[PDB]
């Protein structure tokens, strides 16, 4: 499924991401835009043998189990397939855990580059939340 900007903002707000670990809602919307382009089925294989899954591009070496990654940790205790669902619940619950690991939202490389220190609330502007 490919989400609309405001559609994802509403879904993310319903899953309690607004101000989660001190990050306003617009940071989450911006991160999904630059990570997966709002596509829940986005899958990106890396040269190291790991893959990034779903709307928030969650990594198979540390967070989810895809059974293909050497030295996998599965810190979110979920199959990587659960992160490709049209229902964002599993991706949100794992992102809540990732954001709590020592890096904050910097864990999402695209959030650091494109969203960190910008007017993130423009990503929720015009939405009927």
């Amino acid at each position, epitope marked *: 499924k490919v989400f609309g900007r405001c559609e994802l903002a509403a879904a993310m707000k319903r899953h309690g991401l607004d*101000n989660y670990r*001190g990050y306003s809602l617009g940071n989450w919307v911006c991160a999904a835009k630059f990570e997966s382009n709002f596509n829940t089925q986005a899958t990106n294989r890396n040269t190291d043998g790991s893959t990034d899954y779903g709307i928030l591009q969650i990594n198979s070496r540390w967070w989810c189990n895809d059974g293909r990654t050497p030295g996998s940790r599965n810190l979110c205790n979920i199959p990587c397939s659960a992160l490709l669902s049209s229902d964002i619940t599993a991706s949100v619950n794992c992102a809540k855990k990732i954001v709590s690991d*020592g890096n904050g939202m910097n864990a999402w*490389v695209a959030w*650091r*580059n494109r969203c960190k220190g910008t007017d993130v609330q423009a990503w929720i502007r015009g939405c009927r939340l």
Partner: antibody, heavy 117, light 111 residues
Framework: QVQLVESGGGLVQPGGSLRLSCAASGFTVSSNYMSWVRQAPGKGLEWVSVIYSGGSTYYADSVKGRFTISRDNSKNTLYLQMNSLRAEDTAVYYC???????????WGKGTLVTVSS | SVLAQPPSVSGAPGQRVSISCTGRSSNIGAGYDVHWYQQLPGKAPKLLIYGNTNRPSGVPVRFSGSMSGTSASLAITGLQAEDEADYYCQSYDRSLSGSVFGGGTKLTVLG
């Protein structure tokens, strides 16, 4: 129009404490990413600490557990509380306002901190 | 080091010079953008290049950035006396959880 004025620097002895201030104008400290960067005499820039617009704080390993970054919204001021100061903490301390991706878009002129017995 | 730069670079007026920035898999190699700073003597650093290639207002076209893999570069064409300064590259390191600076490069304009 955007201005950062730091003060509070001076001489302190090893194990001593000092509090630096950074008075801002032309923007709101509370809704911005603010950082402290230091530079030891004739040395390179060293990132010290950051406070995110949402309140998250991060420190360099060298000052972890000794330095505390904080802000006062009414005074529109940024602080750096430095405790258990060591000789190697001697540097010009700069206050910086971050732009996109922790780029340091605006810098203050710096305040000197000397730690010596 | 977490970001390495040559301690010194020199060129003649009108020459093209480049300053390298070598990172690691936890910073530049992880995909984190490189920023560059120019520090004139007796002055605070000033942003020269942001997000690998962008020039802020007032930075001449003779200053350019490049970035691929674990490394980034700062190129200076038509070198002028006014370019003499200390240059620093900067990124983000996910292993250290914070912003990181290269050791700096002192640029000399010989001639």
């Amino acid at each position: 129009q955007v201005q950062l004025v730091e003060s509070g620097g001076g001489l302190v002895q090893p194990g001593g404490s000092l509090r630096l201030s950074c008075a801002a104008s032309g923007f709101t400290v509370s809704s911005n990413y603010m950082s402290w960067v230091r530079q030891a005499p004739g040395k390179g820039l060293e990132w010290v600490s950051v406070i995110y617009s949402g309140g998250s704080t991060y420190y360099a390993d060298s000052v972890k557990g000794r330095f505390t970054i904080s802000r006062d919204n009414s005074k529109n001021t940024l602080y750096l509380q430095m405790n258990s100061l060591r000789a190697e903490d001697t540097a010009v301390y700069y206050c910086a306002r971050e732009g996109r991706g922790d780029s340091f878009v605006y810098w203050g002129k710096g305040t000197l901190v000397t730690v010596s017995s | 080091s977490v970001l390495a730069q040559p301690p010194s670079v020199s060129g003649a007026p009108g020459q093209r010079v480049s300053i390298s920035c070598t990172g690691r898999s936890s910073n530049i190699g992880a995909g984190y953008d490189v920023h560059w700073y120019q520090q004139l003597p007796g002055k605070a650093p000033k942003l020269l290049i942001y997000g690998n290639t962008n020039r802020p207002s007032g930075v001449p076209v003779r200053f350019s950035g490049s970035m691929s893999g674990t490394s980034a570069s700062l190129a200076i064409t038509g070198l002028q006396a006014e370019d003499e300064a200390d240059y620093y590259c900067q990124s983000y390191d996910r292993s250290l959880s914070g912003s990181v600076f290269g050791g700096g490069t002192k640029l000399t304009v010989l001639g």
